[PDB]
């Protein structure tokens, strides 16, 4: 139920016009920025995580 | 009487101890499982969503 | 008219630069309140130095890749983002990095500037493949606040805040009678330029400094529901209120013409049932 | 009543006799928490040969399932009512409409897993405003019977009990109306004859040391069960016919006599001010005596 | 009290057993009980009744 | 929880471990906490299981300790126990 | 190194007697929601207000009673008393007397005018006296506190659920603040809907005070128990107890230390009383002239 709903919501393909084109500097910086601003319902951005 | 420090004592008692939870009908063995009890205010048993 | 403030502290050092401090017994709802206030200060109002620009010789656009360097320019800028630097008293310093040879070009190879302190000298910035390969670059380090991407207006994503990640949990606190108290557990992931505790005390200091400018006796005997007889007898003795009754003593009441021990017993029972008795002094009857 | 109804909620309240309605057109003479007095004949003058009707209201009664059944007046003194008009609301009814619940502001959305699998999350404000608070009356009962070992007695005198425990009990041993009782508290004091046995020698010594001296009787009193409590709103006592009756069966009796007598005074008041106010309009017609009739006694 | 032999011997019997007068045995009974009852050590043994 | 899979790894066929744990806990309860290292928390069952995890207790080793303990019981007694038996004939 | 721009209450728009719009000027971005939520959270639960906690109505014993001459039942009356909005000067408990005879509504305006007590809504209906020979006389206890403290959170009196918090609703807006300098400033507009107990500015300074005070930095058997029971636990006669208290004998430990000689020498104690005291003390294994040698410890 809800868990799936949550995960699916955060893991969804999108046009992603708002948050596209960001190098994550790794999962940590990506997380910061994601909570921050410009990222909503995920984004089409490449992440640096090892 | 419920005199204070009885509570903290009860906390000391259940430490590391586990209780069995069961729901009828018990169709398979997972109808009964063991959990570590966390004392809570209120009259309801709180169950973990994954089980 | 108080509130439960500072009580019992715990510190879980997950590592040399990652800790978990816990402030215990904060009144319910204060978990998210302090959690969000602090999470908001930490994620944007912390003071830290960060790489904002880089000038590498021979390189023009981020699409370039370098002759004699393992990783492409993008990966190099990506490495430069993680350059942890602590500068004395300036809002901009130029670091020069000249390196020829084979192997990793770390932050320790950066030209030693007197003001500039390099937190992690073993921080790899590059990897020169051949022994005739060499890099010469000017890394710009500026002081600022929060995460300011390169897209803002070579340029490199600025992570001015010294803190990488914030997390919080509300968890029910123990604490004596009150029971519905919580404890805010803040998970911090800093870069070691700044200590966790001082980052917290600086966030708190910024917040507080932002708030610096806003800193039964008169009831009738009938309410006792005595027997009709007892009530009438008491009224006959000019005892019309509870206050009048509680002043009389057993001896005195038994001396009055119409009340007996059955009745007196009744009066003591009904009075005792309400926390009252006979022979009560109120010393000041009345005002 | 629900903000979204089907239009059947009035008829249900009407057909179930919990709600009180007016038999004929009339005017409300009196409104009380206890009763409603209605003066008929306002429209079409249906009542004849005496006038008016008194509706007593059920108040804080206890149902089979322990819920409280009570009626509340929906009308005000001097109000014009027609035939079949609502007078009092019963339990779970609002202005003659069926009220089985409350209208709450709801949002449809997941919340931190607290509404997982049909579970529901609520605002503390509901408790704050006493929404979904329910009144309940429980009935407890005790019997004192003849035993082969001697009579069970309902008495305030119970072995080895402090005055703290006995504080809310009257002379008889029965808790007084209005007292707050909590789990373990005594409702009705009762002693039973002991089947009896000599104690163990250690107890002999203990008793001797503290000199309490044992008693022929054992404590059998009715106590409030765990998880229960509240305010004592009634006591009923029945004693064998021609049995030695004490203050227990005398006070309540006397109270019932006073209530019945007042129940006659109010009915004769309503009947008097219900018939004479009709004979006056008849006497005036023909033999008009305004300032003259309001002097001599009503009889 | 019958802790020994299960029989609550009379004061005269115990007194005769110890070669002392009944008054003596009553006196030592009384001081024994006095020692028992006093507030020191009273805790534990006390509060047993309810 | 407590890395139980590893504890079971120390003693094949789950069941046996339980008995061992139980027996060990009884020992703990009966006399002197003693034993192997000493997290000092979460009572006898957790302590026994954790002890098992570091292969501290062992099925055979417990038996060896008991066998030695039997010899310890032999100690004292011995000549004095032999006295009680030699006296009677 | 640019020092932060701090806020200060700049405007107060009283939309009504109990609804206002407070505005803090020149706040750096993102701080709108931060302070907005911190403050909204303090205001909606940590505010101090007066509330009715007990009520003593004449003739009424249990809240379930219904009154001769009163339209609504006692429960409805207490529920009405819950909504009694009172602002008291400087006290944590005040008794209000309400005497009313007649026909019609008995409102808060009929409450006996106390100098300290301010009644926010005088037209607030507490009762409805039906007949003209009907009358109520009640003593309403109003206390100062915090949050919602129900009657269940525990004498011929009744208890009423305490709703101490003065504020009903809070709302906020972030809105860009003016001034050509810096340009990147906002202004927090807090819309308040209170019950009229508290002023906007002081509510803000109190929310802020609670916030700031939460942030106060981050740093890094022997003897018999019966001896400490009050003499009332002995259940003596009223007279004996009062005499003993009059002799500074408030606990069992105090009593068992005194001797018969000393007690009889006191002005108010005679042979009867001393006999009673020895009887009750002996009944619990105690006596007079008991040495406890060490009165007391700490």
Curated annotation (Swiss-Prot), chain B:
PTM notes: Acetylated on several lysine residues in the presence of glucose.
Use in biotechnology or industry: Co-administration of salinamide and rifampicin or salinamide and myxopyronin suppresses the emergence of resistance to both antibiotics.
Function: DNA-dependent RNA polymerase (RNAP) catalyzes the transcription of DNA into RNA using the four ribonucleoside triphosphates as substrates.
UniProt family annotation: Belongs to the RNA polymerase beta' chain family.
Complex formation: The RNAP catalytic core consists of 2 alpha, 1 beta, 1 beta' and 1 omega subunit. When a sigma factor is associated with the core the holoenzyme is formed, which can initiate transcription. The rRNA transcription and antitermination complex (rrnTAC) consists of RNAP, NusA, NusB, NusE (rpsJ), NusG, SubB, ribosomal protein S4, DNA and precursor rRNA; S4 is more flexible than other subunits.
UniProt-recorded name of the protein: DNA-directed RNA polymerase subunit beta'
Lineage, uppermost ranks: Bacteria, Pseudomonadati, Pseudomonadota, Gammaproteobacteria, Enterobacterales
Gene name per UniProt: rpoC
Entire-sequence positions represented here: 403 to 453 of 1407
From Swiss-Prot, chain C:
ADP-ribosylarginine PTM positions: 229
EC number, UniProt record: 2.7.7.6
UniProt catalytic activity: RNA(n) + a ribonucleoside 5'-triphosphate = RNA(n+1) + diphosphate
Region (Alpha C-terminal domain (alpha-CTD)): 216-287
Cellular component terms per the entry's GO annotation: cytoplasm; cytosol; cytosolic DNA-directed RNA polymerase complex; membrane; transcription elongation factor complex
Modified residues (N6-acetyllysine): 261-262
InterPro entries (alphabetical): DNA-dir_RNA_pol_insert, DNA-dir_RNA_pol_RpoA/D/Rpb3, DNA-dir_RpoA, RBP11-like, RNAP_asu_C, RNApol_insert_sf
Keywords: Acetylation, ADP-ribosylation, DNA-directed RNA polymerase, Nucleotidyltransferase, Transcription, Transferase
UniProt-recorded Gene Ontology molecular function terms: DNA binding; DNA-directed RNA polymerase activity; protein dimerization activity
The protein's role, per its UniProt record: DNA-dependent RNA polymerase (RNAP) catalyzes the transcription of DNA into RNA using the four ribonucleoside triphosphates as substrates. This subunit plays an important role in subunit assembly since its dimerization is the first step in the sequential assembly of subunits to form the holoenzyme. Part of the processive rRNA transcription and antitermination complex (rrnTAC). The complex forms an RNA-chaperone ring around the RNA exit tunnel of RNAP. It supports rapid transcription and antitermination of rRNA operons, cotranscriptional rRNA folding, and annealing of distal rRNA regions to allow correct ribosome biogenesis.
Name of the molecule in the record: DNA-directed RNA polymerase subunit alpha
Species of the source: Escherichia coli (strain K12)
From Swiss-Prot, chain D:
Biotechnology usage: Co-administration of salinamide and rifampicin or salinamide and myxopyronin suppresses the emergence of resistance to both antibiotics.
Region forming the signal peptide: none
Top-rank taxon, per record: Bacteria
Protein modification: Acetylated on several lysine residues in the presence of glucose.
Family that this chain belongs to: Belongs to the RNA polymerase beta chain family.
Role of this protein: DNA-dependent RNA polymerase (RNAP) catalyzes the transcription of DNA into RNA using the four ribonucleoside triphosphates as substrates. Resistance to the antibiotics salinamide A, salinamide B, rifampicin, streptolydigin, CBR703, myxopyronin, and lipiarmycin can result from mutations in this protein.
Subunit (UniProt): The RNAP catalytic core consists of 2 alpha, 1 beta, 1 beta' and 1 omega subunit. When a sigma factor is associated with the core the holoenzyme is formed, which can initiate transcription. The rRNA transcription and antitermination complex (rrnTAC) consists of RNAP, NusA, NusB, NusE (rpsJ), NusG, SubB, ribosomal protein S4, DNA and precursor rRNA; S4 is more flexible than other subunits. In pull-down experiments interacts with CedA.
Protein name: DNA-directed RNA polymerase subunit beta
Underlying gene: rpoB
Residues included from the entire protein: 697 to 995 of 1342
UniProtKB/Swiss-Prot annotation, chain F:
Biological process terms in GO annotation: bacterial-type flagellum assembly; bacterial-type flagellum-dependent cell motility; cell motility; cellular response to cell envelope stress; DNA-templated transcription initiation; intracellular iron ion homeostasis; nitrate assimilation; protein-containing complex assembly
Superkingdom field: Bacteria
SMART domains for this protein: RNA_pol_Rpb6
Enzyme kind, highest EC tier: transferase
GO molecular function, one term: bacterial-type RNA polymerase core enzyme binding
EC code(s) of this entry: 2.7.7.6
Signal peptide: none
GO cellular component, one term: RNA polymerase complex
Annotated TM spans: none
Keyword vocabulary terms for this entry: DNA-directed RNA polymerase, Nucleotidyltransferase, Transcription, Transferase
Biological role stated in the UniProt entry: Promotes RNA polymerase (RNAP) assembly. Latches the N- and C-terminal regions of the beta' subunit thereby facilitating its interaction with the beta and alpha subunits. Part of the processive rRNA transcription and antitermination complex (rrnTAC). The complex forms an RNA-chaperone ring around the RNA exit tunnel of RNAP. It supports rapid transcription and antitermination of rRNA operons, cotranscriptional rRNA folding, and annealing of distal rRNA regions to allow correct ribosome biogenesis.
Similarity section: Belongs to the RNA polymerase subunit omega family.
Name recorded for this polypeptide: DNA-directed RNA polymerase subunit omega
Record organism: Escherichia coli (strain K12)
Underlying gene: rpoZ
């Amino acid at each position: 139920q809800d868990v799936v709903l949550g995960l699916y919501y955060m893991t969804r393909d999108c046009v992603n016009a708002k948050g596209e084109g960001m190098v994550l500097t790794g999962p940590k910086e990506a997380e910061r920025l994601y909570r921050s601003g410009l990222a909503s319902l995920h984004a089409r951005v490449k992440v640096r995580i090892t | 009487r419920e005199e204070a420090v009885v509570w903290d004592i009860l906390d000391e008692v259940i430490r590391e101890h586990p209780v069995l939870l069961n729901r009828a009908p018990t169709l398979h063995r997972l109808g009964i499982q063991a959990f570590e009890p966390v004392l809570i205010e209120g009259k309801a048993i709180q169950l973990h969503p994954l089980v | 008219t108080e509130f439960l403030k500072p009580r019992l502290v715990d510190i879980e050092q997950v590592s040399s630069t990652h800790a978990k401090v816990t402030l215990e017994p904060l009144e319910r709802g204060f978990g998210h309140t302090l959690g969000n206030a602090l999470r908001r200060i930490l994620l944007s109002s912390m003071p830290g130095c960060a790489v904002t620009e880089v000038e590498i010789d021979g390189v023009l656009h981020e699409y370039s890749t370098k002759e004699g360097v393992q990783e492409d320019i993008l990966e190099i800028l990506l490495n430069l983002k993680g350059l942890a630097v602590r500068v004395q008293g300036k809002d901009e310093v130029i670091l020069t990095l000249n390196k020829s040879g084979i192997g990793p070009v770390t932050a320790a190879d950066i030209t030693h500037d007197g003001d500039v302190e390099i937190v992690k000298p073993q921080h790899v910035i590059c990897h020169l493949t051949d022994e005739n390969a060499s890099i010469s670059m000017r890394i710009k380090v500026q002081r600022g606040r929060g995460y300011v991407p390169a897209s803002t207006r070579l340029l490199v994503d600025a992570c001015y805040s010294p803190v990488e990640r914030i997390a919080y949990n509300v968890e029910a606190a123990r604490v004596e009678q009150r029971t519905d108290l919580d404890k805010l557990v803040i998970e911090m992931e800093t870069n070691g330029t700044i200590d966790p505790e001082e980052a917290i005390r600086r966030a708190a200091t910024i917040l507080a400094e932002q708030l610096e400018a806003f800193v039964i006796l008169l009831r009738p005997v009938d309410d006792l529901e005595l027997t009709v007889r007892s009530a009438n007898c008491l009224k006959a003795e000019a005892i019309h209120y509870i206050g009048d009754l509680v002043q009389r003593t057993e001896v005195e009441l038994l001396k009055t013409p119409n009340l007996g021990k059955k009745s007196l017993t009744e009066i003591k029972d009904v009075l005792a049932s309400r926390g009252l008795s006979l022979g009560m002094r109120l010393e000041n009857w009345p005002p | 009543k629900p903000l979204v109804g089907t239009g059947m909620e009035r008829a249900v309240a009407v057909d179930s006799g919990v709600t009180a309605v007016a038999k004929r057109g009339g005017v409300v003479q009196y409104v009380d928490a206890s009763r409603i007095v209605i003066k008929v004949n306002e429209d079409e003058m249906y009542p004849g040969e005496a006038g008016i009707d008194i509706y007593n209201l059920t108040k804080y009664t206890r149902s089979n399932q322990n819920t409280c059944i009570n009626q509340m007046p929906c009308v005000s003194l001097g109000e014009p009512v027609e035939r079949g008009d609502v007078l009092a609301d019963g339990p779970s009814t609002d202005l003659g409409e069926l009220a089985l619940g409350q209208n709450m502001r709801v949002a449809f959305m997941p919340w931190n897993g607290y509404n997982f699998e049909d579970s529901i999350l609520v605002s503390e404000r509901v408790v704050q405003e006493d929404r979904f608070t329910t009144i309940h009356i429980q009935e407890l009962a005790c019997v004192s019977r003849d035993t082969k070992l001697g009579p069970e007695e309902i008495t305030a005198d119970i072995p080895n009990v402090g005055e703290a425990a006995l504080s809310k009990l009257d002379e008889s041993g029965i808790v007084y109306i209005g007292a707050e009782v909590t789990g373990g508290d005594i409702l009705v004091g009762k002693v039973t004859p002991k089947g009896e046995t000599q104690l163990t020698p250690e107890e002999k010594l203990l008793r001797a040391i503290f000199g309490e001296k044992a008693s022929d009787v054992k404590d059998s009193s009715l106590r409030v069960p765990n998880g229960v409590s509240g305010t004592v709103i009634d006591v009923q006592v029945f004693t064998r016919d021609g049995v030695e009756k004490d203050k227990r069966a005398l006070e309540i009796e006397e109270m019932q006599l006073k209530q019945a007598k007042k129940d006659l005074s109010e009915e004769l008041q309503i009947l008097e001010a219900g018939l004479f106010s009709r004979i006056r309009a008849v006497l005036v017609a023909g033999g008009v005596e305004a300032e003259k009739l309001d002097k001599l006694p009503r009889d | 009290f019958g802790i020994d032999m299960n029989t609550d011997y009379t004061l005269e019997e115990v007194g005769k057993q110890f070669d002392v007068t009944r008054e003596r045995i009553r006196q030592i009974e009384a001081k024994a009980l006095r020692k028992l009852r006093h507030p020191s050590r009273s805790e534990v043994l006390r509060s047993f009744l309810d | 929880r407590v890395t139980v899979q590893d504890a079971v790894e120390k003693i094949g066929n789950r069941f046996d471990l339980v008995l061992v744990a139980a027996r060990r806990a009884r020992q703990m309860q009966v006399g002197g906490k003693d034993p192997l290292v000493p997290e000092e928390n979460d009572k006898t069952t957790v302590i026994a299981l954790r002890e098992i995890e570091e292969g501290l207790i062992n099925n055979q080793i417990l038996d060896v300790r008991e066998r030695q303990e039997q010899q310890e019981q032999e100690a004292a007694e011995l000549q004095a126990v032999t006295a009680i038996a030699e006296g009677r004939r």
